[PDB]
Each structure stands twice: as C-alpha cells, then as structure tokens.
Structure 1
C-alpha cells in the first residue's frame, strides 16, 4: 500500500480561521486565529511561523501576520480586511499560507490552503480548522 500511503494528506499542521462579509462597509473580514501541530524541524527545532493572507487573482501585496518565534502552536489572533464589493467577490479565492521565517535564507513554506469565495456561505460567520496542504 505504499503508493496509497504516499497519496494521503501529510501531517503539516492545521490553521483555524474565520471569515465574514461586512455588508454595511462592503468589506471581507478575515480572522487568522491560531495554528496547531506544525511539523518539527531537524535537531528537535521548532519553526518561526507566520501567515500570508491574500486574494487571487488580485495582484496587490499580500497581508502577513506577525512572526511567532520558536513555536509549533502559535496563537495569532489577527484580523485583516479586504475592501471588495460583494458583487466582485465570488470570482476570487482567499489563500492562507503558513511560512517559517528565517532571517538568512528563503522562508520555507510549511503549507497552504485556499477558500474560493463562490463556496463561501455569506451572511453567517465561517470558522473552521483546515489541514495545511503541501506546496
């Protein structure tokens, strides 16, 4: 069953987020809440996680949480706002990507996932845990 095991979702941790569309101010609100069970490094190391948060296909610069040093279970508790009228949302996709900050080399991705806005349930707050997907 090795081929089948290789196809399984790898244990790269999970991110909890929330989402709500503010119809008063016409903006998408995103909560980056916390991550859990991020993978250990070699030599028993922990990573320095942060999250990038952004819409596709939009080309504007990505939002980022603070970096949380030396933790596999960070609590971010950050909010981000996207000023996009509802009518223009559905064709877009929200991306959340967790990276390992390093000062001296490329920041390795830990993993990512995507939320197409056309299967967002508008008008109720969305909150879930999502397994980070390999990249």
Structure 2
C-alpha cells in the first residue's frame, strides 16, 4: 500500500512586529508506517528555498512510535514582505532512524510555483497580513 502516505496541517503568518514570516506545524494525520513495528517516528523538516543563508532550514522535535504526531511548534524567518513572494517553502516529512539512513514518508510545497490548495495557502498569507491562515495538505513524493 504505497497510497497511504498521509496529510499535514500547516500554518502561516507574517508578523510586522517581529518583522518576519512564522511557519507553524501543528500535526500530521495517518502517516506511512516505515518501520518493523507497524508505526513510524516522524518529524517535519522545513526549507525556505532558494536564496536563504543558515536560517533557511528548520526542523521539529522527533515524536516516536506514532502515526498522528503532536508538534505544536512555530519557526521564525527574518524576511521582508516584498522578498517573501518569490521564495518557496519545501515542507518535508521524514521517518527518523538512529541505526541507519532515514526513510522518506512524504512531502509538500508552498509558493508561487505551487498549484491549487498549496497556491491559495500562499496567496491568502501574503494578502492577509497579521492573520493566521491554516489548512491541510496531502503528502506527495520525490523531495529526496
């Protein structure tokens, strides 16, 4: 069953006070169990591509033996509202392994290049300043 990949709930808001875009990750739903115990050890890895320095990539805490995790975290990006349009947020989902290389559950994207629900999430965020827009995204393949 390759199709049972899952869903992810993303949150966005541009803070004028703080002077940046805050990406919130609340929880996933029904992730692909890629272990030898019918479960996963998922964690979300954010990457605001392409031209960003050492503060480009961020990661959540690691929740273990659950397919419906509970992150409730938020990450700050020191970015300008004008410059924020042309960027793209590659939200990836990974299954952690201590003993060997990590397994890829699924992935998502948000930007001007994106389409549909992904595009309308990125559109409403830039239009509605100082407003927390939140919506689900179905996970897709091939972000390494």
TM-score (norm 2): 0.80
Which one has the largest radius of gyration?
1
- 8 Å contact from structure 2 (residues 34, 105) kept in 1: no
Aligned-partner Cα distance in 2 for 1:42–1:82: 33
Is it true that 1:130 corresponds to 2:137 in the alignment? yes
The equivalent position to 1:69 in structure 2, one of 64, 68, 72, is 64
Aligned-partner Cα distance in 1 for 2:99–2:51: 29
Is it true that 1:48 corresponds to 2:41 in the alignment? yes
Shifted more, 82-91 versus 59-68: the winner is 59-68
Shifted more, 56-65 versus 115-124: the winner is 115-124
Runs of 5+ in structure 1 lacking a partner?
A: 1-8
Number of residue pairs the alignment of both structures matches? 127
- 8 Å contact from structure 2 (residues 11, 24) kept in 1: yes
**1:16 match:** 9
Root mean square deviation, CA, Å: 1.9
Aligned-partner Cα distance in 2 for 1:44–1:104: 15
Shift of 1:81: 0.5
**1:80 match:** 75
